[PDB]
Design a protein around this ligand. Structure first.
Ligand SMILES: NCCc1c[nH]c2ccc(O)cc12
Ligand SMILES: NCCc1c[nH]c2ccc(O)cc12
Ligand SMILES: NCCc1c[nH]c2ccc(O)cc12
Lengths: 262, 257
């Protein structure tokens, strides 16, 4: 059975999950409870058109740009959460300050789209802490540029959600992503790889124990990292376009600094 | 079980040795230590290299070096494709798949495999060309004009990082098969058998790296992560290709590529 070595890995899995719950208000378990009608109290208001969109603010706490900006500042909130979660990853705060920054700079968006999948199903995405639900079709009819921002996310979410991962799995996977090491401009790579090595090891045991009958889930989850990269890139390229077409629209500095050379 | 896996690994390795002339073991021998390859470090080196080792299979197409070099890479990649295609057919289950899916897997998998194996022929200083009879330097490749100078550079960066895993032919053989059986290629008609085979290949690769590298921790994970680098190198490559269509200003030859 489990021995000294694996015992440490389990403790690490437990630690990360505990921190995950403490850093992210809307977990996948809650998102799913809300989406699957496991309630009467958790049911969200649905926005599927301008009609409902209007009453949206009248139900939950340029429309195309309005929505974009909302989602734009939502990312900023997420960065704040992910950053707080990173600090809890053993060894992360002990790394060179500059590396901590590049790791966050390049890891944040891949994490945002990973977790955003938790709030999606083929028809839409939860919003405003789960009080609302904006349909995929509405978002796709937005307007020439903006109508294309979310489709890639939905595409990924459908595939990713197929893995049926839960919060305890994600917490470790999210940690692995932050501690990459192949990130552009890392001053010290070895210490970072040593940590990711331990996290990868922890994730592997977690998926084994948590998904016994799921053959090679580990390899399958790791490969998803390529889909995330493409999502990030398309998104960035899309911003560049909006930046030129919408000269009056402003971008949050935190997000602006992250996009720099992404 | 664990036996069926070792058998699969051995099978793939044997098949790999028969389909690929220049193996990594050979390539490494040459790159390190009796008959030094002809080195091409500049214009004159190249000039002599053409009538020397006689990799005059590409050049014969009756000027400019950057263009003749790029075109040469093309002639070689086309040979690679046939070699990969042969190898693919040895992968248990591959031929029993829908015919269109087989073509689809090959169509989208050869580029990723080409760069993977290309790493076997490179080091931080250069790449082995024409069956290893040559060695074109990394600096001479950058010194090339227009976007031609930035074509191989990306591959070199990949190679340097990829080679650090110190995989050998028996490891690469399985890895390459895993790449081919990717059930996320667009247009596939029946993803199930494909994923079933890859799952089986992944299990084979995992055990292989466990026995072949008891020393390297989570090697399996690191190799899988490289599949990301490959996709990026491939998409990035396709970009220089479109951009290449602005250096033009045979019809049957163009058809071949
Ligand atoms: N990077 C902007 C995409 C994004 C991140 N988090 C989100 C939440 C809701 C939404 O509609 C969109 C988003
Ligand atoms: N499930 C990860 C996304 C997430 C975490 N906390 C949140 C709070 C509000 C929200 O809309 C979304 C989130
Ligand atoms: N054999 C390494 C592939 C390659 C890159 N550039 C080349 C130029 C000529 C040639 O024969 C081959 C190549």
């Amino acid at each position: 059975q489990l021995n000294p070595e694996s015992a440490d890995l389990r403790a690490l899995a437990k630690h990360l999950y505990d921190s995950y719950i403490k850093s992210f208000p809307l977990t996948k378990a809650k998102a799913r409870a809300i989406l699957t009608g496991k309630t009467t109290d958790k049911s969200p208001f649905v926005i599927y058109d301008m009609n409902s969109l209007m009453m949206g603010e009248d139900k939950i706490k340029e429309v195309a740009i309005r929505i974009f900006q909302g989602c734009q500042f939502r990312s900023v909130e997420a960065v704040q959460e992910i950053t707080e979660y990173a600090k809890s990853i053993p060894g992360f705060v002990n790394l060179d300050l500059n590396d901590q920054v590049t790791l966050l700079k390049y890891g944040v968006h891949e994490i945002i789209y990973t977790m955003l999948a938790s709030l999606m199903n083929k028809d839409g995405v939860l919003i405003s802490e789960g009080q609302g639900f904006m349909t995929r079709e509405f978002l796709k009819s937005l307007r020439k540029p903006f109508g294309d921002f979310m489709e890639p996310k939905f595409e990924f979410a459908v595939k990713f959600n197929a893995l049926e991962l839960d919060d305890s799995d994600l917490a470790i996977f999210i940690a692995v992503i932050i501690l990459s090491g192949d990130r552009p401009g890392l001053l010290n790579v070895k210490p970072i790889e040593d940590i990711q090595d331990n996290l990868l090891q922890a994730l592997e045991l977690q998926l084994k124990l948590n998904h016994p009958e799921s053959s090679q889930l580990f390899a399958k989850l790791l490969q998803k990292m390529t889909d995330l990269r493409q999502i990030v890139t398309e998104h960035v390229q899309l911003l560049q376009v909006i930046k030129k077409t919408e000269t009056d629209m402003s971008l949050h500095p935190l997000l602006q600094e992250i996009y720099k050379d992404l």
